[PDB]
Amino acid sequence: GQVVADVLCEFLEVAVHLILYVREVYPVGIFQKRKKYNVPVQMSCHPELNQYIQDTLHCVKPLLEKNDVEKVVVVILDKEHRPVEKFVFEITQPPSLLSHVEQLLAAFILKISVCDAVLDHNPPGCTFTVLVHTREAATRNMEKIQVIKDFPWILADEQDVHMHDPRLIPLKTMTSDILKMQLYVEERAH
Amino acid sequence: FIPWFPYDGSKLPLRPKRSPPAS
């Protein structure tokens, strides 16, 4: 079939690993420097954490091939399970020698680093989760994402998603015949 | 800059039932 869904998941894995490093969701001791898209990134070497990120994106992949993803959101939650930050990846797919996709995806990875300079430091003890905004309403077909048997998905509710008048931090916008994608941050006032 | 898909309270997103390991 077509493959831009394959490169988006590996990109999202790299982006999630980097966000956990830049926003300091996990200690530096579990991160190691790797190269992806010819840029240095900090990848997690924690096995259980890696299996969670991979199991999450292994279910997102079939939805990308079907063109059923508006947004993939990484949500940082404080110790009271309240969203303090949201990294929103708005995704649009318009109708193989394509390192152009990688050089375009590499620019999104390069932008994530600036979050250390423009965002205020998160409270200690934060956790994270991933929100997937399907194009077709998720309530219509809940089984489409249940591709891994021991990794079930549920509908989020407003406590996991809602932030009261959050500050919007635009990071990067890209439009192309290949890929259209925006990355921005919804930050709590605090 | 404008977000393409503003926050819609009607169409709730999906979330993994499990939680990542604590730091």
Numbering used by the authors:
A (entry chain A): 12 to 106, 114 to 208
B (entry chain X): 38 to 60
Paper text:
Next, we coexpressed full-length REV7 (R124A mutant) and a fusion protein that contains SHLD3 (residues 35 to 58) and a short stabilizing REV3 sequence (residues 1887 to 1894) (labeled SHLD3s). REV7 Arg-124 was mutated to Ala to improve crystallization. The reported structure of the REV7–REV3 complex implied that the additional short REV3 sequence could potentially enhance complex formation. We then determined the crystal structure of this SHLD3s–REV7 monomer complex at 2.7-Å resolution (X-ray statistics in SI Appendix, Table S1). There are two molecules in the asymmetric unit and the bound SHLD3s can be readily traced into its density in the complex. In contrast to the safety-belt region that binds multiple partners, site-S, which overlays with the REV1-binding site has sufficient complexity, making it ideal for small molecule drug design toward attempts to disrupt the Shieldin/NEHJ pathway. In addition, the site-S interface shares one pocket with the adjacent REV1-binding site and another adjacent one with a pocket identified by the PockDrug server, implying the potential for druggability of site-S. Since disrupting of the REV7–REV1 interaction can inhibit mutagenic translesion synthesis (TLS) and reduce chemoresistance, such a two-component pocket scaffold (adjacent site-S and REV1-binding site) spanning the REV7 surface could represent an attractive future avenue for improving DNA-damaging chemotherapeutics by simultaneously inhibiting error-prone NHEJ and TLS.
Human Shieldin consists of four subunits, REV7 (also known as MAD2L2 or MAD2B, 211 residues), SHLD1 (205 residues), SHLD2 (835 residues), and SHLD3 (250 residues). As the first identified member of the Shieldin complex, REV7 is composed entirely of a HORMA domain, acting as an interaction module in a broad array of cellular pathways. The Shieldin complex acts as the key downstream effector of 53BP1; it not only binds and shields single-stranded DNA ends but also mediates CST- and Polα-dependent fill-ins of DNA breaks. TRIP13 forms a hexamer to drive the REV7-mediated disassembly of Shieldin in an adenosine triphosphate (ATP)-dependent manner, thereby releasing the DSB DNA ends for resection to promote HDR.
